[PDB]
Amino acid sequence: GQMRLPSADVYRFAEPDSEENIIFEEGIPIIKAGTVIKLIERLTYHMYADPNFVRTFLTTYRSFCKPQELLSLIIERFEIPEPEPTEADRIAIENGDQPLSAELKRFRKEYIQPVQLRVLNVCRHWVEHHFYDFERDAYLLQRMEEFIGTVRGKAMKKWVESITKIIQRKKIANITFQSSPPTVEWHISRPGHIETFDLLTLHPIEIARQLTLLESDLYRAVQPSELVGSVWTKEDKEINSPNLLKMIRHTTNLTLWFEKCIVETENLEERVAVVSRIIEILQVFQELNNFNGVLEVVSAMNSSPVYRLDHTFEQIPSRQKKILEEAHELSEDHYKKYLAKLRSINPPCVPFFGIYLTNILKTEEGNPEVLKRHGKELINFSKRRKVAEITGEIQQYQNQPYCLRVESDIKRFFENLNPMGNSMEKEFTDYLFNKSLEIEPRNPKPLPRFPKKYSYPLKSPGVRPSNPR
């Protein structure tokens, strides 16, 4: 038979399941909705572990339970009463013999020890992967340190001593590869001559590599805390989502730099060379699976100032027209081909973040926080699972590092890029559009001629890498 449980009057987590406190989806069960008590029971269930659920719960719980209250509830879960001696134990003791304590021993082995270890696993995941709760509430951290540091008894001792050390390390807080990274490539600009760095003077291969390292680092720095609750759209977004916003602002700046390089090149022949070079950078982005970089280029080519430059795009080689067209097709039909390509490639990659943001926001906005059943309000956990499926996908692509060498001067050049200068956005984008009208006027105005601005060769070195001994 099943183990008997403590009275629900002394231990709240022994109340029987009912549709008034938990609802399952239609081989471990998947929870659609429940009370916070039932969610925590299943988070730390004696019959099975549910590591996905631990991640889902710790990522999303603040929408229905405060951090201080979560800690109180898992401490309450941990403190399980032991059953009294049975009739057979009583009779043995009355005869001066040692009781077998069979029911007590089974309850310890199959209920107390698994539940307690799974509570500690929640604590361990909380500290290791969601430490921001403790960075933002020093008293919460004190309570966690006190709880862990006062767990007695030898069955939990190894993990209690370990979690104590992990907490202390997190308070005061290296890559190996299958091969060597390829050699850094140089074109007109030579190493150390940062004053000459520009779109056409750096090697297009190395532009794409260094932007990919930068954009990968920005992608990898975004934590779920910047996403749950749609906080990057709210009034405190600069406080709550700074790494996400830094990543987006880099993408915007690079797109605008591409547009500025194009329309400020007034000579037609030179401007064709500029556009052709940007499409070569896009080709290397594709080879590197840097989809953020691919769409940075596509966004620039589709911008109002650039899209209308028919005289320029007429002279682009056919093979480059095809590269740009197949990159543009990734975004068509609501990113259908992009989504399929992302799910097919071999990482490392840099995803485009915008789709994730829209899906998290619409999942939050389109589903209710609670479900009303039998007069009770149950937490709608299915909504939180959907959000955590998205944050889990994001995290999966954050793991794999690029095997490319940093070039510190090229990295600094792109970190310091500032195409808008001190201008406001409307000012600047109106300037770009007026430049477009200057260099290729609306029909029937005649096409003017403009002097060259570059004194160095415009011929591209190409995007196939070289390898000296």
Binding site: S230, T233, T252, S299, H334, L361, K362, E365
Partner: protein, 167 residues
């Protein structure tokens, strides 16, 4: 077969813009949504007795990718320009959204509707007369919608389709 209309929702972030399309496309009568599902943004409808397919692009949440707006806007035949009735700044943004649409589409007469969205119970700061006057100055319809009761949602999209049909 039936005509497909490519509609684009534009407007300030953080003020409930996404509720318009969610409420339209939703199981009208079950409050639930999975935006990741293929064709959670396509809906077959009958407008004035003529069946058509709406394909709605709503990039809510991507407002900070400001250099992508041109690309997203060029996909559209008609536009819903959305502001929140309790956020004056989102109303003041409308002029620049309209100017950007006209530039991207290279036309002074692009099908569009102005939508004032009530996204919570916070106090209204844009009166309906202010929004009606703005819409009239542009020559476009004005529709007010609730983000909670679905009121006005069908009217906003159907009015835009009629603007496309009568262009």
């Amino acid at each position: 077969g039936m005509t497909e209309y490519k509609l684009v929702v534009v407007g300030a972030g953080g003020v409930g813009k996404s509720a318009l399309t969610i409420q339209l496309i939703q199981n009208h009568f079950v409050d639930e949504y999975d935006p990741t599902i293929e064709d959670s943004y396509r809906k077959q409808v009958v407008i004035d007795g003529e069946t058509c397919l709406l394909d709605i692009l709503d990039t809510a949440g991507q407002e900070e990718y400001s250099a992508m707006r041109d690309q997203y806007m060029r996909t559209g035949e008609g536009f819903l320009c959305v502001f929140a009735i309790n956020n004056t700044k989102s109303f003041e943004d409308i002029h620049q959204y309209r100017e950007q649409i006209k530039r991207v589409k290279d036309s002074d007469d692009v099908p569009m509707v102005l939508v004032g969205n009530k996204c919570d119970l916070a106090a209204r700061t844009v009166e309906s007369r202010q929004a009606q006057d703005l819409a009239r100055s542009y020559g476009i319809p004005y529709i007010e919608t609730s983000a909670k009761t679905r009121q006005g949602v069908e009217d906003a999209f159907y009015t835009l389709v009629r603007e496309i049909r009568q262009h």
